[PDB]
């Protein structure tokens, strides 16, 4: 099965100038917890945004142009990206906006962090149909000394 994982600010903003304009260590630890020992698929812009391979995961990068780094797997289409994962229980799609748009219809599960931050942005999470999805887990956290915004961890499963 295919799952999406993302962190969204107000108005579904997920990025600005190829960067993440917030710092929530709690949310990054949640990202690691739910992606470790799984394959992760990302587009080339998100790969450049991270700037380095993610340890303990099979990194698969979508790009129409040849790869430039043998520490990861490069693929040229959604179907190849999926096939390159092999037979695993859960494929994690980690963005970005363009990549989210193409994998949303295939996905059975959404790992969404809702961040109470107002952010100008140039990239958005897709406007998914709420009727299609059932919320099966939610966990709200107030801001603290490490996390300057309040946030809500949510898991949605396609009905
Ligand atoms: N908050 C979050 O959860 C989160 C998560 C991830 C990223 N982000 C943010 O999202 C932004 C980047 O998003 P983005 O939409 O601009 O880029 P993206 O989706 O990360 O990458 C797009 C690139 O991926 C390749 N690609 C996508 N689909 C393909 C296909 N079917 N076949 C071949 N190649 C394909 C293309 O590479 P080529 O141009 O090489 O063909 C395309 O230019 C940044 O601001 C990042 O910080 C946020
Ligand atoms: N919920 C969520 N939050 C995010 O910040 C996020 N980010 C991306 C893409 N960008 C990034 C940027 C940095 C790291 C990163 O450095 N991760 C380390 C941090 C571990 C930690 O700090 O505990 C990792 O090993 O996963 C991952 C993804 C995709 N999905 C997300 N999903
Ligand atoms: Mn507004
Ligand atoms: Mn080689
Ligand atoms: Mn197979
Ligand atoms: Mn805030
Ligand atoms: Mn759309
Ligand atoms: Mn509804």
């Amino acid at each position: 099965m295919i799952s999406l994982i993302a962190a969204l600010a107000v108005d579904r903003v997920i990025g600005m100038e190829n960067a993440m304009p917030w710092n929530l260590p709690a949310d990054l630890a949640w990202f690691k917890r739910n992606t470790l020992n799984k394959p992760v698929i990302m587009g080339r812009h998100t790969w450049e945004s991270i700037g380095r391979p993610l340890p303990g995961r099979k990194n698969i990068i979508l790009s129409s142009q040849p790869g430039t780094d043998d520490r990861v797997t490069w693929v040229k289409s959604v179907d190849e990206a999926i096939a390159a994962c092999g037979d695993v229980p859960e494929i994690m799609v980690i963005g970005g906006g363009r990549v989210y748009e193409q994998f949303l219809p295939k996905a059975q599960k959404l790992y969404l962090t809702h961040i109470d931050a107002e952010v100008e942005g140039d990239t958005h999470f897709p406007d998914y149909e709420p009727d299609d999805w059932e919320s099966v887990f939610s966990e709200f956290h107030d801001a603290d000394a490490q996390n300057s915004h309040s946030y809500c961890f949510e898991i949605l499963e396609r009905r």
Side-chain angles (χ1 to χ4, degrees):
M1 64 170 257
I2 294 167
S3 305
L4 278 51
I5 181 157
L8 290 57
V10 167
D11 291 344
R12 305 200 321 279
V13 172
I14 62 168
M16 183 52 183
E17 302 174 350
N18 222 34
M20 206 146 290
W22 56 73
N23 109 286
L24 298 175
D27 173 53
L28 287 172
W30 160 274
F31 175 90
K32 192 187 184 189
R33 184 182 311 124
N34 290 306
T35 56
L36 196 71
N37 303 311
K38 305 177 185 176
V40 295
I41 298 171
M42 74 199 87
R44 181 181 52 88
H45 290 322
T46 289
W47 156 249
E48 297 173 0
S49 184
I50 303 171
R52 46 187 59 74
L54 293 172
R57 281 148 282 192
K58 184 169 186 179
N59 288 236
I60 294 173
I61 316 301
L62 276 157
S63 180
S64 65
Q65 305 187 25
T68 58
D69 193 326
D70 276 331
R71 301 176 293 170
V72 297
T73 298
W74 296 83
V75 290
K76 297 184 186 298
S77 64
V78 165
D79 284 325
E80 184 185 6
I82 295 172
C85 295
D87 232 302
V88 311
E90 194 175 21
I91 294 170
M92 304 300 287
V93 184
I94 63 168
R98 301 291 301 175
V99 167
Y100 286 139
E101 220 197 353
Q102 288 166 93
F103 278 99
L104 173 66
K106 298 178 168 58
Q108 280 276 293
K109 196 173 184 174
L110 304 177
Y111 302 73
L112 296 182
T113 309
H114 304 294
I115 301 172
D116 288 318
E118 177 200 7
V119 163
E120 293 301 316
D122 53 24
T123 308
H124 294 84
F125 192 81
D127 182 20
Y128 64 94
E129 170 62 48
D131 288 6
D132 291 336
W133 298 91
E134 177 187 6
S135 180
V136 306
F137 176 91
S138 63
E139 175 178 283
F140 175 77
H141 293 268
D142 276 305
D144 56 31
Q146 301 175 38
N147 304 266
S148 64
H149 297 289
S150 58
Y151 52 98
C152 185
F153 295 137
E154 183 173 28
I155 304 173
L156 303 91
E157 300 185 339
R158 188 185 293 278
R159 294 185 315 93

